Design a protein around this ligand. Structure first.
Ligand SMILES: CC(=O)O[C@@H]1[C@H](O)[C@@H](COP(=O)(O)OP(=O)(O)OC[C@H]2O[C@@H](n3cnc4c(N)ncnc43)[C@H](O)[C@@H]2O)O[C@@H]1O
Ligand SMILES: NC(=O)[C@H]1CCCc2c1[nH]c1ccc(Cl)cc21
Ligand SMILES: [Cl-]
Ligand code: NA
Ligand SMILES: [Zn+2]
Length: 272
């Protein structure tokens, strides 16, 4: 006795849902070639034995970064924007934006692929910050994101040209304050008429709890390998779970929306 994925498509087609709030995590970028955290076998938290860490979470903790920033920058050579491309998941969200349906996209990812896919900054809440800008950890001087990359790609720990203190990209490490734009969740979540949650385990707060901030009649559509978080534990009557690979699930929705040729055209134009 549940809504189907077709029911969600048909709400969108009818513009009965036209203020969509989306929440994403690391699962949406595995198809682009970036590991997630928690997937058995391939996740970061399963495969950081080599790094100089007390435990894997440490690489993304501000305290440990001060001790040794090397593991973080070693790893960020890779993760640094330029070398991965958005996938169909990202371009679907672009298409939602272009059709006037996207209220806001909240991302936990630092890969920057939402911006890469053409989502305007005003539509985006990068809840864990960005590599696009950087900041001295001693003097607070801001820097050209790009300038820091020069150093990172050439295997050097970025130091301030002024105080020589370590320059850190504007990423929210563990325990750190969320970015200023995160405050938009108070205007957004009550206004949302559909919530889409893609590729996240919903293990970390505040995202786990935002899924409960939408009004009780709002459908929640999960596209993800597993049923997770508040959707597993506190199901609501208009929840839909499309479980399986995220690209498959998005492609199923896109087909039900009638957008398949538009998405093919989009993707070919952008990346093909
Ligand atoms: C360091 C920090 O503060 O923040 C990071 C991160 O932003 C935060 C949230 O983790 P996040 O929820 O983003 O990542 P996780 O790695 O915790 O969750 C990824 C979710 O995506 C699913 N998944 C991965 N690939 C998939 C695929 N191809 N198709 C379908 N599902 C797939 C995977 O099963 C999991 O549920 O945990 C970490 O603590
Ligand atoms: N695809 C990603 O962006 C994921 C996987 C790459 C590392 C990463 C992600 N999300 C993060 C959130 C905070 C911090 Cl410090 C790191 C990450
Ligand atoms: Cl070895
Ligand atoms: Na050490
Ligand atoms: Zn400095």
């Amino acid at each position: 006795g549940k809504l189907s994925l077709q029911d969600v498509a048909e709400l969108i087609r009818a513009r009965a849902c036209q203020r969509v709030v989306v929440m994403v995590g690391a699962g949406i970028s595995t198809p682009s070639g970036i590991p997630d955290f928690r997937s058995p076998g391939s996740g970061l938290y399963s495969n950081l034995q080599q790094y100089d860490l007390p435990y894997p979470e440490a690489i993304f903790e501000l305290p440990f970064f001060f001790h040794n920033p090397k593991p973080f920058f070693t790893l960020a050579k890779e993760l640094y924007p330029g070398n991965y491309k958005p996938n169909v998941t990202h371009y679907f969200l672009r298409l939602l934006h272009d059709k006037g349906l996207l209220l806001r996209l909240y991302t936990q990812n630092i890969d920057g692929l939402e911006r890469v896919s053409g989502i305007p900054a005003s539509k985006l809440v990068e809840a864990h910050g960005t590599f696009a800008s950087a900041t001295c950890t001693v003097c607070q001087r801001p820097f050209p994101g790009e300038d820091i990359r020069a150093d990172v790609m050439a295997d050097r720990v970025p130091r301030c040209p002024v105080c020589t203190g370590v320059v850190k990209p504007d990423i929210v490490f563990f325990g750190e304050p969320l970015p200023q734009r995160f405050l938009l969740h108070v205007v957004d979540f009550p206004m949302a008429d559909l919530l889409l949650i893609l590729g996240t385990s919903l293990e970390v707060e505040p995202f786990a709890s935002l899924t409960e901030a939408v009004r009780s009649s709002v459908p929640r559509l999960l596209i993800n390998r597993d049923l997770v978080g508040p959707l597993a534990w506190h199901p609501r009557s208009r929840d839909v779970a499309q479980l399986g690979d995220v690209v498959h699930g998005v492609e199923s929705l896109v087909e039900l929306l009638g957008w398949t040729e538009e998405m093919r055209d989009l993707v070919q134009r952008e990346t093909g």
